Amino acid sequence: RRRQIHACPPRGLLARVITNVTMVILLWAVVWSVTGSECLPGGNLFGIIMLFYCAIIGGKLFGLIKLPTLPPLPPLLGMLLAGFLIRNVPVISDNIQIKHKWSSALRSIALSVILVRAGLGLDSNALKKLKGVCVRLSLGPCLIEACTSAVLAYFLMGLPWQWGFMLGFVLGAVSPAVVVPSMLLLQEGGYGVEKGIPTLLMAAGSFDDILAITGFNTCLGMAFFNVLKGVLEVIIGVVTGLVLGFFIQYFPSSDQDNLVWKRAFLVLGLSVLAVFSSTYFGFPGSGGLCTLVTAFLAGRGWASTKTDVEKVIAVAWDIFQPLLFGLIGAEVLITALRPETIGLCVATLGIAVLIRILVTYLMVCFAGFNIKEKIFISFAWLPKATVQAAIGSVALDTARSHGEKQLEGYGMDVLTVAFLSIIITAPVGSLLIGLLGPRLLQ
Amino acid sequence: RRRQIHACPPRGLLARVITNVTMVILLWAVVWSVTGSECLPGGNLFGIIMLFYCAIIGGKLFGLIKLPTLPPLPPLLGMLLAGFLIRNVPVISDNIQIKHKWSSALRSIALSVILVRAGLGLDSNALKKLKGVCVRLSLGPCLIEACTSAVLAYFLMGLPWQWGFMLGFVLGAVSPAVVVPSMLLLQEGGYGVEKGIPTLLMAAGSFDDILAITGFNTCLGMAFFNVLKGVLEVIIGVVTGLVLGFFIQYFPSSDQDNLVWKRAFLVLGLSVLAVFSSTYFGFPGSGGLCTLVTAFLAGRGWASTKTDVEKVIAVAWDIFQPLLFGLIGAEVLITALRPETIGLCVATLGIAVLIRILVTYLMVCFAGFNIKEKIFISFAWLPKATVQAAIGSVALDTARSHGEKQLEGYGMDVLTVAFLSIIITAPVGSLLIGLLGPRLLQ
Numbered sequence A, B: 001r002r003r004q005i006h007a008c009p010p011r012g013l014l015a016r017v018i019t020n021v022t023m024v025i026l027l028w029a030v031v032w033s034v035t036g037s038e039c040l041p042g043g044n045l046f047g048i049i050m051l052f053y054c055a056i057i058g059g060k061l062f063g064l065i066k067l068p069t070l071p072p073l074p075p076l077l078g079m080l081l082a083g084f085l086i087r088n089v090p091v092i093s094d095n096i097q098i099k100h101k102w103s104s105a106l107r108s109i110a111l112s113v114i115l116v117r118a119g120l121g122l123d124s125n126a127l128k129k130l131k132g133v134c135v136r137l138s139l140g141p142c143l144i145e146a147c148t149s150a151v152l153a154y155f156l157m158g159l160p161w162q163w164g165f166m167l168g169f170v171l172g173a174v175s176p177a178v179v180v181p182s183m184l185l186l187q188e189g190g191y192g193v194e195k196g197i198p199t200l201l202m203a204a205g206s207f208d209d210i211l212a213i214t215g216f217n218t219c220l221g222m223a224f225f226n227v228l229k230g231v232l233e234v235i236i237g238v239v240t241g242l243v244l245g246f247f248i249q250y251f252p253s254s255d256q257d258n259l260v261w262k263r264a265f266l267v268l269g270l271s272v273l274a275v276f277s278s279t280y281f282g283f284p285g286s287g288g289l290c291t292l293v294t295a296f297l298a299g300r301g302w303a304s305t306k307t308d309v310e311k312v313i314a315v316a317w318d319i320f321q322p323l324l325f326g327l328i329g330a331e332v333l334i335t336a337l338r339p340e341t342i343g344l345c346v347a348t349l350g351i352a353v354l355i356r357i358l359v360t361y362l363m364v365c366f367a368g369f370n371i372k373e374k375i376f377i378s379f380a381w382l383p384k385a386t387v388q389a390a391i392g393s394v395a396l397d398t399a400r401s402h403g404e405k406q407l408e409g410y411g412m413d414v415l416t417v418a419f420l421s422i423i424i425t426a427p428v429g430s431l432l433i434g435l436l437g438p439r440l441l442q
Helices: A002-007 A012-034 A044-064 A075-087 A100-121 A132-153 A161-171 A180-189 A197-204 A208-223 A226-250 A259-281 A286-300 A306-329 A343-363 A372-380 A386-402 A405-440 B002-007 B012-034 B044-064 B075-087 B100-121 B132-153 B161-171 B180-189 B197-204 B208-223 B226-250 B259-281 B286-300 B306-329 B343-363 B372-380 B386-402 B405-440
Strands: none
Touching (some): A044 A075, A044 A306, A075 A306, A100 A197, A100 A286, A100 A306, A132 A161, A132 A197, A132 A208, A161 A386, A180 A197, A180 A306, A180 A405, A208 A286, A226 A286, A259 A306, A259 B012, A343 A372, A372 A405, B075 B405, B100 B180, B100 B259, B100 B286, B132 B161, B132 B197, B132 B343, B161 B208, B161 B386, B180 B306, B208 B226, B208 B286, B208 B386, B226 B259, B226 B286, B259 B286, B343 B372, B343 B405, B372 B405, B386 B405
């Protein structure tokens, strides 16, 4: 009985794993019993959890083992690669499938989470100190990049201006989902004196989404008035944010307890509800500005406990981020291997991004930013995120409803170039800003 | 602006309510968005929450306001009355409905929870000190009460012995769901020296359910062999409990952290899975003994942290109890007002309960219990619980499948008398034992 005596003391190396496996299988059985639909290996909820775990392990691997010597390996590239691998394997694409509506809802939820996290961390008096530079950085470079991309596309691909206008509007847009965490980390660190520069970027790269989607919708309609519709959407979002601000302003008082969890849940639910209501009513994207205005008003309410809830919101964002990246990167199966002289698209997107950098450097030549701040701001505006993927999916769906072969091919080319741009410029830009933060604004 | 100045300081009296209402409506909207099915006011999940809240408020009212001077008002009566009111109002019965399968699953879950809570709190060495009295109290009085009830029914109602046998088997059964909390509270209190008496009752009033259901199934089949089937079920339950005991015995070790939550979740999930597997395979009720054996083995594992998990399991049971009572009491709509000379049924059930008390006093005349312990044990075995309702529902469903009018009427009479017995003897017995605990075994 030597083996029995030796194995009598439990071995935590071989005991922890068994306990974890038993707990996981028990939870999975409970989930299956509660709902036998979309919980099987061929279901959606199983696929969501599998994608979440794959994104988590990919992010860990891209940064814990094969990270470069000086620059750490960002997890964004790992998450995008995991999504690409999940989507682009036929034998591992039929087993795991996700509903389009669920994907869109999760994308909206993640965008609302990152927007409210950015708004909560914003510092006051920045608007009064320098709002003009923020407004110019929000307005100018987006339109300039869209126009330059349209010009570059024209006389190059042969598509009419309507397709060129749509491509320029789609490409010329930066979504804060990829840049906000970097700005928040930089502000938490701090180099020299942060004279509102991180908050400046956070505010500037937030509400250009409404203008981008308005232009895209107008161009799509012309390819098939609404500028006033978008203006009304902006006004409605501002008014809703102003109205909702007075609620967190007073209802949470010192009398109540557990203010952290209650306030965080309240603001997150309000943001999600506003975004979903705006999308359902018929004018999506206004909730994106509404939640930012609500967070700004909550800061104006002098909550004095931002860091109490900032930690919880940061944890929630860290949970949601791999899911968001996997959802974005797991919708490229159609063009998995379609070489159609993609080098033209690569050249167009690269030239457009370079023009964006140049104009962003031009847009910050007024005052304050001498050299290093100019360069950092220019390189910070570079990346793009979920907004481009969502608008491209909408454009492709519209094209494949009453369109012929030529329009289908044009939409396919636009979707491919947009996906490639999202794949390239986002993680490279994130790594660049992460490495340049401690190296430019010290 | 006098009103504005006066209302400028928030009033927590009028502010807490608004915040709670906003949180509740936000959660309800989230639930509706996640699932638009069975979450509407006409759905099931809405009905479950409404029943839970009604049971909670009824239990609070029956004990916080209209409690008698010396004896506090038990909440069991309030919960049963709330269930009766919910079920027996046509305009408030169509709006809230609950699936039969969901009700049965929740009943099984609650029974498993109370069984594992009883088993965890059991004290060792009690079996070796006096197991014979426990075995006799488990076996004898159940069969004697069933036989006496059958005899009383015969020559009284005119139904044949097959119906009389079924009625006696159904009536002659005590389910621990109503007595275990009282025993645990009494053991926590302690009067003089508790020489295993509470644990004796907890063990004795646990595994008679298998014998009761086996007899009921055999009688139902005869009305349409299985004794060996029930014996095999008991053996299978014992073997499964023995096998599962070695798992909590070693897998949770000192290396792991958060032992309380992990162990509690593990044991609860194992009990639920065992009960559901036993029910699905074709031999229900064996999991009821299996979970008790598993808890006894976990105690034999010297967990030394029972009170750490006993608190959590007690909280879970306190959550589930109003739901269980509401589910039991919300299935009497058919016979809401059907006076069919019910006094005969009342007399039969009263005589049967009195005979149960007399034989229980007779069964404890061996040793140890001198006078007061005898009386307390006799009065403790009195109540009945969910088991009778479940078996009566099964009997009625079997009757209304291939049966004629006479069999339907017999089944209806049996169901009515069973419901009346559950209504009467359970809360009265609970209040009696609660008041007599500090007054008999001091």
